[PDB]
RNA sequence: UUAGGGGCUCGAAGACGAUCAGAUACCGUCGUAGUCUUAACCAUAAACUAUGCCGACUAGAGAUAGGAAAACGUCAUGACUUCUCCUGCACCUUAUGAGAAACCAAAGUCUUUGGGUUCUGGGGGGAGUAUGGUCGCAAGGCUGAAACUUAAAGGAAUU
C-alpha cells in the first residue's frame, strides 16, 4: 500500500529532478526528497562569545554568522533525530515546527 | 470524440436527475433528441423544455420532475422483430408492469407499448424508468 | 505522593455545598464537624476528609470554585443577572456607518438618521 | 412479564394505547428505542401472527491478547412475521446464549417493512418483490427478480429463510460475490428488502397528505410524565 | 397500488420529500417535518399552517435552507 | 441451566452481589473452568472476609471429578460515606 | 420594521469574516476594502419572520432546545428560556443527548436552535439521528450542513448575539399572543440579553 | 559494445591494511575498464501516477504558472492591490458517489449493468526456462511451450 499520496519526492510534471549528495551518509538522494535544514548560527555559541567582545579591537562589532544549508538521506536524518517518525494522522501535517 | 449525442445528454441529465436539480441544460442538442424527450413528456416523467435557436446546434434546457429513477442509450443500435421486445424488456427494464424502451421504427420514433399495437419493429434507441 | 481519591473528594466536596456555614477556615473544629454531620467510619479517613474540606474554604475564600453547587453564588449570581442600565441601543439617534456600510441602505431603501464618518 | 417503564416520548405512547400500529412510525420514520414497543404490538394470538425468530447462525471469534485466547460467540439472528415485516441483527458475547438474547433484541429494533407486487395480472394478494431490486454489503451483491406465482423462492437455503421471513412467496435470486460469508450475505438480502418502498413507481406520483405526527396529536399527554 | 377493483394493497404510503420529491423510506432517521404557523390581519394567531417534509439526503449537502426558501416563496411569506 | 438457577436465587434472596465457579472437564477431555458472575464482589483486605462468605465442595461424575465455588457478597462498610441533607 | 434593521447597525451585525462560503454567499453582498463581507439586513430580518413562525405552532414550547458552546450565548440563552418557556443548555455539551436512552440528560426535542453550527456541530450531527430539525445563526465561515433556516448575522460579537436573541422572543411573543398591542415595543430592556466581565 | 579523441575527480575488477571464529563484504588507502565527447550500435529500468487514449457531465474554498479584459485603484511601457475569464502542474475539505479495504474529483455517473476504441490477464510453481523462429558485432531483445508438481500462493486492514 501506499505510505504516502506524495511518495515522499514531492515531485509533480517533471520525470527527472536534479541531486544532491547527504552531508553524512554521502548517498545520492533526489534533491526534492533529500530533507533540508538550512543553519544559520553564530560562530562562537552565545556564552562563550562575551570574550570576543571583551578582548577586541573596535567599539562594538557584530560576530559575522554562518551560513551552510546541510542536506540529509533519510536514513542519516532518521538516525541523527532530525526528523524521528510520526502517526498515520499526524503525518499530513506540513507546516513548521518552530517558526 | 463525439460519437452519440443522444448518449451524452441522458447522461447529463440523470445525473443531475439525483443531484435533485429543478432544471438542466443539454448540448449540442438534435431532432432525435427532442423526439426523444417528446415521448418520455406523454407518459409523464418530465415538464416542458424549451430549445433555444442559436445559430449552432442548439441548448434544450428542460424542466424535470423528481420521476425519473435512470434512462439510458442502447448502443449499439440493435434490431428487434416483434418477437423479440418481450425478450429485451425481461432482461432490461426493472418490472413487466412499468417502465418503457424506446425504439425508432418506419412509422416514427415510438414506445415498445405503441410498436406492438402498429405491429412493426425496429432499431433500439434506449429506456427508461 | 499525597493525592486523594474520588471516595475523599466526594465526601468533602459535597460537604462544603450544604454544610458550608458553620466550619471555619480552622481544622480542628472542621475535624470535629465532619464526624458530627456524616458517617465517616475510620480515624485516618476523618482528619484526611476534614482537611481537604478547609483547602476547598480556602479555596472559596480566595475565589469562585468550580463544581460547586453550594448556591450562595448562584443567589449572588442572579443578583448580576437581575440588573439592567438605562440602554445600550438607540443612542443617540444618529448611527456610525461608513462608506459601505451606509450604501447598503442607499441600495436597499428604508430611510433613517445616519452618519458618514 | 413484564412491565417495563416506558422511556422516552414513543415508549409512553405505545404503553398507553394512542398510536394504532407500526405503519405511523414508518411513515414519520422515528427510530424506536426499546424492544418493548414492538413487544406490544405482535401479541401472541392477537397479533396475526406473532413475529418469529429463527438463529441463522453462530460463529466463533477470537482475539489474540497477550497470554492465552479470548473467544466470544457472534450471533446472527433474522426475526419476522410473515405479511412484509422483517428484521436483521447481531450481537457478540462471552456465552453462546447471552449473545442471541441480544441478537434477537436487535433484530426487533432493527424492523423493517417491506412492500411487495405482483408480476404482471395483479389478483388476489401481492406474492413477490415488485420489480427488480438489487442490495450489496462488502463484495456480496444480491438481487431479487419478480416471478410468476407458485415459482417459490428460487436462491440459496440462507435466502429462502429471510425473504420467507418477510412473506415473500416468489422470487429469482441472482448472487455475486463471496456469498460464504453469512454475515454480508443476509445484511445485502435485507438492504435488498429495505429499498423497495425506498423505490419511485408511477403509482406514488400522486403528491402526499401530510398528516400530523404521533409527536404532534398526542403532545398534550407528553407534557406531563 | 390496487389490485382487481379497488382496496389500495401494502401497508402506508412514504413521505415524499418536498425539495426531491423522492421519497423519504421507513429507517430515514435524518428526515424532517417542519410547521410554519399562518397569521390573520394584525396577527398574532397559530393553528393554520403550512406543513413541509425534507429528507437527510438533501440536508446533508447543505441543500436544505436553499430549497426551503423556494417552497415558501411560493407560499406567498418570503419575498427572494 | 443449574447454575443459573442458583445464582438466581441468592440474587433474589437479598445478596448485594455473588459469582459460582465451576472448574473441572466439560463436553470436553481438556479441563475447561466456566465461570458465572452478577452483582459486585470484592476480593481484597480484612473487609473481605467479613462482607463475604465463600465455600467450595467436589462433585463426582462418570469422566472424572469437578470443581464447584460459590462467593456472596453481603449486606458499614469502610469505602462508602453516606452524608446526611441539613434542610 | 424599520427599527430593528436600524438596531443591526449597532450591533455589527452586518459585520462577518473575511472567508465566505459557498451555500451562505447569497446573503453577503458588495464585500469591503480590507476583505470584510457584508449581509443584506432585509434579507436578515425577513429569516426572523420565518424562524418565529416555525417557533410558533409547537405547542409544549419546552420541547425546543436553545444551545450555545461560547460563553457571550449563556447570559442570552438562559433569558431567552423564560419567556419562550424552552430547555436550554450552556457550555459542554456532553453527546448522546438525543441518542442513548439511559444517560439522565436524555432530551428527546421536537425543534433545536443552535448559535454556531461550527462551534457546537456535534449537537448538528445529533439532530439527524432523531429527526430534529435544526435553527441557527449563522456567519460566513460556518457550516450548513445538517442546517434548516438560517439567521445570517455576526455570531463572535457579544453584542450581536443577543440582539437576536431579543428579536426571536420579541417577535415570537408576538406571535404567540403574549403582547397585545404593537404600539409599545416591549417592556424588558436588551441589556438582560448580553455577557459581563465578572 | 565498436572506432577515433580526452582522461580532472570518482571508481565494478585487482591490490594490500583493518574488523571477525572466518570476511573474497561493510570501514580505510591506492587503482585499470568506465565516467566526458564525435561517429555508429544496443532497445531494456520500481522507463511509476505501479492508474491506456479521445468525449460528455457531476463541488465548492484558497493558493500557483502563462495569456487576456476591467478599475477616476496605490506607488513610478513595468511593479503591486481588487475582481472575472479560459489553459497548466497540484493541494485542502466533503460526499445518499465508488471500493475488499488502504484510499479515490477519479478508482464517480456499472445488476437502476451498452458514448467510441487499442493492448493485456484467468490458482501457485515448472518458466520468461526448453525447442524453433527472427533482430543483434556480442551482451542479450521480441515471440514462447510441455512433461511433472502443488492446496493453497496473493491483497487490505485487526489484535
Not at chain 2, 434512462?71 to 432490461?92: A, H, M, T, Y
Not at chain 7, 417557533?55 to 450555545?68: G, H, K, T
Request: with cysteine; charged share 25%; glycine share 8%.
Amino acid at each position: 500500500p501506499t505510505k504516502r499520496r506524495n511518495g515522499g519526492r514531492a515531485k509533480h510534471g517533471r520525470g527527472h529532478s536534479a541531486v544532491v549528495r547527504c552531508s553524512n551518509c554521502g548517498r545520492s538522494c533526489p534533491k526534492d526528497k533529500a530533507i533540508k535544514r538550512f543553519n544559520v548560527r553564530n560562530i562562537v555559541d552565545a556564552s562563550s562569545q562575551r570574550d570576543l567582545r571583551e578582548a577586541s579591537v573596535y567599539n562594538t562589532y557584530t560576530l559575522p554568522k554562518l551560513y551552510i544549508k546541510q542536506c540529509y538521506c533519510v536514513s542519516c536524518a532518521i538516525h541523527s533525530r532530525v526528523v524521528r517518525v510520526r502517526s498515520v494522522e499526524q503525518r499530513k501535517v506540513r507546516e513548521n515546527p518552530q517558526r | 470524440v463525439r460519437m452519440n449525442v443522444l448518449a451524452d445528454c441522458l447522461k447529463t441529465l440523470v445525473n443531475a436527475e439525483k443531484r435533485g436539480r429543478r432544471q438542466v441544460l443539454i448540448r449540442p442538442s438534435s431532432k432525435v433528441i427532442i423526439k426523444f424527450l417528446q415521448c418520455m413528456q406523454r407518459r409523464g416523467y418530465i415538464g416542458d423544455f424549451e430549445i433555444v435557436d442559436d445559430h449552432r446546434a442548439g441548448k434544450i434546457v428542460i424542466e424535470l420532475l423528481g420521476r425519473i429513477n435512470k434512462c439510458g442509450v442502447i448502443s449499439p443500435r440493435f434490431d428487434i422483430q416483434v418477437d423479440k421486445i418481450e425478450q429485451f424488456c425481461s432482461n432490461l427494464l426493472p418490472s413487466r408492469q412499468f417502465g418503457h424502451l424506446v425504439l425508432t421504427t418506419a412509422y416514427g420514433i415510438m414506445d415498445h407499448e405503441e410498436a406492438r399495437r402498429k405491429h412493426t419493429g425496429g432499431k433500439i434507441l434506449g429506456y427508461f424508468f | 505522593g499525597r493525592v486523594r481519591t474520588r471516595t475523599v473528594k466526594r465526601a468533602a466536596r459535597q460537604i462544603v455545598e450544604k454544610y458550608y456555614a458553620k466550619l471555619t477556615l480552622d481544622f480542628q473544629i472542621n475535624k470535629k464537624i465532619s464526624e458530627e454531620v456524616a458517617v465517616i467510619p475510620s480515624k485516618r479517613m476523618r482528619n484526611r476528609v476534614a482537611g481537604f474540606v478547609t483547602h476547598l474554604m480556602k479555596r472559596i475564600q480566595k475565589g469562585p470554585v468550580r463544581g460547586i453547587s453550594l448556591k450562595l453564588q448562584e443567589e449572588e449570581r442572579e443578583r448580576r443577572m437581575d440588573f439592567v442600565p438605562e440602554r445600550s441601543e438607540v443612542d443617540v439617534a444618529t448611527i456610525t456607518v461608513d462608506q459601505d456600510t451606509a450604501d447598503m441602505l442607499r441600495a436597499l431603501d428604508i430611510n433613517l438618521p445616519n452618519v458618514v464618518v | 412479564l413484564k412491565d417495563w417503564v416506558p422511556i422516552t416520548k414513543l415508549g409512553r405512547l405505545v404503553r398507553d394505547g394512542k398510536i394504532s400500529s407500526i405503519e405511523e412510525i414508518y411513515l414519520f420514520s422515528l427510530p424506536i428505542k426499546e424492544y418493548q414497543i414492538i413487544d406490544h404490538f405482535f401479541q401472541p394470538g392477537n397479533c396475526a401472527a406473532p413475529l418469529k425468530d429463527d438463529v441463522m447462525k453462530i460463529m466463533p471469534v477470537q482475539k489474540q491478547t497477550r497470554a492465552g485466547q479470548r473467544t466470544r460467540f457472534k450471533a446472527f439472528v433474522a426475526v419476522g412475521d410473515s405479511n412484509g415485516h422483517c428484521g436483521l441483527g447481531v450481537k457478540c458475547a462471552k456465552e453462546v446464549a447471552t449473545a442471541i438474547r441480544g441478537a434477537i433484541i436487535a433484530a426487533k429494533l432493527s424492523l423493517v417493512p417491506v412492500r411487495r407486487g405482483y408480476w404482471g395480472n395483479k389478483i388476489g394478494e401481492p406474492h413477490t418483490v415488485p420489480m427488480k431490486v438489487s442490495g450489496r454489503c462488502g463484495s456480496v451483491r444480491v438481487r431479487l427478480i419478480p416471478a410468476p406465482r407458485g415459482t417459490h423462492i428460487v436462491g440459496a437455503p440462507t435466502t429462502k429463510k429471510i425473504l420467507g421471513f418477510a412473506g415473500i412467496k416468489d422470487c429469482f435470486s441472482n448472487s455475486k460475490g463471496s456469498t460464504k460469508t453469512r454475515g454480508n450475505f443476509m445484511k445485502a438480502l435485507f438492504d435488498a428488502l429495505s429499498q423497495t418502498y425506498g423505490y419511485l413507481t408511477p403509482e406514488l406520483w400522486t403528491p402526499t397528505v401530510y398528516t400530523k405526527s404521533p409527536y404532534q396529536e398526542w403532545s398534550d399527554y407528553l407534557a406531563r410524565t | 397500488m390496487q389490485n382487481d377493483e379497488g382496496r389500495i394493497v401494502d401497508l402506508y404510503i412514504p413521505r415524499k420529500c418536498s425539495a426531491t420529491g423522492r421519497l423519504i423510506p421507513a429507517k430515514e432517521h435524518g428526515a424532517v417535518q417542519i410547521n410554519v404557523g399562518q397569521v390573520d390581519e394584525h396577527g398574532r394567531y397559530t393553528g393554520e399552517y403550512h406543513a413541509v417534509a425534507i429528507s437527510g439526503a438533501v440536508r446533508q449537502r447543505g441543500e436544505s435552507d436553499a430549497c426551503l426558501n423556494r417552497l415558501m416563496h411560493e407560499k406567498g411569506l418570503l419575498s427572494f | 441451566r443449574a447454575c443459573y438457577g442458583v445464582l438466581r436465587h441468592i440474587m433474589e434472596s437479598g445478596a448485594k452481589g455473588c459469582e459460582v465457579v465451576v472448574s473441572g472437564k466439560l463436553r470436553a477431555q481438556r479441563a475447561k473452568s466456566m465461570k458465572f458472575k452478577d452483582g459486585y464482589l470484592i476480593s481484597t483486605g480484612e473487609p473481605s472476609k467479613m462482607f463475604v462468605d465463600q465455600a467450595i465442595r467436589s462433585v463426582q461424575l462418570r469422566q472424572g471429578v469437578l470443581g464447584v465455588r460459590v462467593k456472596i457478597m453481603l449486606p458499614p462498610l469502610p469505602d462508602t460515606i453516606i452524608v446526611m441533607d441539613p434542610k | 420594521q424599520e427599527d430593528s434593521i436600524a438596531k443591526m447597525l449597532i450591533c455589527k451585525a452586518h459585520i462577518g469574516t473575511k472567508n465566505v462560503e459557498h451555500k451562505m454567499r447569497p446573503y453577503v453582498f458588495k464585500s469591503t476594502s480590507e476583505g470584510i463581507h457584508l449581509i443584506n439586513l432585509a434579507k436578515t430580518w425577513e429569516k426572523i419572520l420565518m424562524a418565529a413562525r416555525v417557533i410558533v405552532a409547537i405547542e409544549n414550547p419546552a420541547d425546543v432546545l436553545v444551545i450555545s458552546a461560547r460563553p457571550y450565548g449563556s447570559r442570552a440563552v438562559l433569558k431567552f428560556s423564560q419567556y419562550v418557556g424552552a430547555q436550554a443548555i450552556a457550555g459542554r455539551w456532553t453527546p448522546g443527548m438525543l441518542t442513548n436512552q439511559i444517560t439522565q440528560k436524555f432530551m428527546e426535542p421536537r425543534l433545536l436552535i443552535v448559535t454556531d453550527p461550527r462551534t457546537d456541530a456535534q449537537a448538528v450531527r445529533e439532530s439527524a439521528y432523531a429527526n430534529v430539525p435544526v435553527i441557527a445563526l449563522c456567519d460566513t465561515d460556518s457550516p450548513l450542513e445538517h442546517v434548516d433556516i438560517c439567521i445570517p448575522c455576526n455570531n463572535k460579537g457579544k453584542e450581536s448575539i443577543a440582539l437576536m436573541y431579543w428579536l426571536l422572543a420579541r417577535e415570537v411573543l408576538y406571535l404567540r399572543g403574549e403582547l397585545p398591542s404593537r404600539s409599545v415595543p416591549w417592556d424588558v430592556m436588551v441589556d438582560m440579553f448580553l455577557w459581563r466581565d465578572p
